[PDB]
């Protein structure tokens, strides 16, 4: 037999209080978005609780992606 | 077909690059200018008609301008024997010729690929190898003064009216795409390290200059004059194959150095 719970292991991250956040956890979360051997360089978190409601999270990779000169692949 | 081919040739030349199911079928709708038709395009399929018997594979060249390639230093040997060649002088022509490598049992080989040889009469073999076995020391001692730029210098058969020329290697890039890549806008700058093609120099032991070098070679072991003459001739040869120098002042000074002797008194 086998029991496999790892189908969901990455906890959602864009909901917590911005102040209580360290850098390492950003590190592990960024690891499990693109399988690689490196960390990020900068991050950005904010939100706009206006008449529109939403939130966003952005990263800045260290090394440029090698495949950006395509034309119409699935972006 | 003349008015059609002048307009939408870009589409076919691109399509031949990226497709696999239908490539052999598309290998005949191309029209080129050959060295038997002054101002008329010639089909390559119809070209398959008239070749010699012992010959193998089609011969071709790629250049930058029609006239610039029309009279090139390499050709002056393969043109005297009555063969037939074609000119693909356009950036996409390199893309087409790079991928396609065959046509109806034949091969596509260009002039500047690691010293091509053509079958011919027997008696020329012995004199050429005599030049091989007699001119080993000048070929030996010239590599010392030239540091690690060229790979090898030899005597081959593409030169009848020019002393020197430059040819590339099989595993590597070619001269015209060396400029298609620099002229390309959105590209990385880490790729030049690896697949630059190593360079080969070719000498002609017919021009009296090379023989005049021999007397000072066995006469003087080394001095300033040999260094000056060799760097001058090499830098001139670098221009001969469409290569662009990195320090034009260095050669401009060397060309201005003697025009002052032309009228006499420098000082």
């Amino acid at each position: 037999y086998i029991d496999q719970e790892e189908l969901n292991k990455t906890k959602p991250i864009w909901t917590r209080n911005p102040d209580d956040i360290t850098q390492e956890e950003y590190g592990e979360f960024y690891k499990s978005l693109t399988n690689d051997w490196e960390d990020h360089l900068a991050v950005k978190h904010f939100s706009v609780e206006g008449q529109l409601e939403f939130r966003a999270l952005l990263f800045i990779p260290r090394r440029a992606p090698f495949d950006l000169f395509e034309n119409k692949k699935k972006k | 077909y003349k008015k059609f081919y002048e307009a939408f040739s870009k589409n076919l030349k691109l399509g031949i690059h990226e497709d696999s199911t239908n490539r052999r079928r598309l290998s005949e709708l191309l029209r080129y200018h050959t060295s038997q038709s002054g101002d008329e395009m010639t089909s390559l399929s119809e070209y398959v008609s008239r070749m010699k018997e012992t010959q193998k594979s089609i011969y071709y060249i790629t250049g930058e301008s029609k006239e610039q390639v029309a009279n090139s230093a390499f050709v002056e040997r393969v043109r005297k024997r009555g063969f037939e060649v074609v000119y693909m002088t356009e950036p996409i022509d390199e893309y087409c010729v790079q991928q396609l490598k065959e046509f109806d049992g034949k091969s596509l080989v260009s002039v500047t690929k690691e010293g091509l040889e053509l079958p011919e009469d027997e008696e020329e073999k012995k004199k050429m190898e005599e030049s091989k076995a007699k001119f080993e020391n000048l070929c030996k001692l010239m590599k010392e003064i030239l540091d690690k730029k060229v790979e090898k210098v030899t005597i081959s058969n593409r030169l009848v009216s020019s002393p020197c020329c430059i040819v590339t290697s099989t595993y590597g890039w070619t001269a015209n795409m060396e400029r298609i890549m620099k002229a390309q806008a959105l590209r990385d700058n880490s790729t030049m390290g690896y697949m630059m093609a190593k360079k080969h120099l070719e000498i002609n032991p017919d021009h009296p200059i090379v023989e005049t070098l021999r007397q000072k070679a066995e006469a003087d072991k080394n001095d300033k004059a040999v260094k000056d003459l060799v760097v001058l001739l090499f830098e001139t040869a670098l221009l001969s194959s469409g290569f662009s120098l990195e320090d034009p002042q260095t050669h401009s000074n060397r060309i201005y150095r003697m025009i002052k002797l032309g009228l006499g008194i420098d000082e």
Binding site: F66, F69, N71 | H17, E18, Y95, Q98, Y171, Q184, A185, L186, R187, T191, M195
Partner: protein, 186 residues
Amino acid sequence: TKPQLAIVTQWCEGSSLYHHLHIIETKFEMIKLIDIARQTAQGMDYLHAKSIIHRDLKSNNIFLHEDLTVKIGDFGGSILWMAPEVIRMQDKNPYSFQSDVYAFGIVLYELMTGQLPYSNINNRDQIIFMVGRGYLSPDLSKVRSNCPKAMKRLMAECLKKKRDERPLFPQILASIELLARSLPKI
């Protein structure tokens, strides 16, 4: 006067593999070799996952593209080293996944090793007659010093009695991934 906008490229050619085996090495640390192994194993597993045969994976059929990336070729170390299953010409269908598994094993082992087995004695007719009766066994002295324990155990366990009870691909992949992510330094 009527400006413009930038234009992009198309793509570039990669280099081969087998050329690297004899002439030019350009040796970095073996981590790159293990990375090559894991990408190529993943690729061939994906290919075979759709019940797809290959009928050959000769070491020249690999193009080392940008960085270290394998592109599998088809057109023209184990080019004469397949099982006598090829020599079997009974029922005209000896083809099976077992030959592909064994060929991948020997090819990757030699690619790690870096040099050719069986280069001293070469007699095709006598080799095949000896295959008929008195078949040989692989040499054991020809082995690398730093042979990883997991891979050594896998390759030793692959062929014991019959070349038919070989394992199935993803546990090989799991062994690859555990051995890779079990010895970076710690």
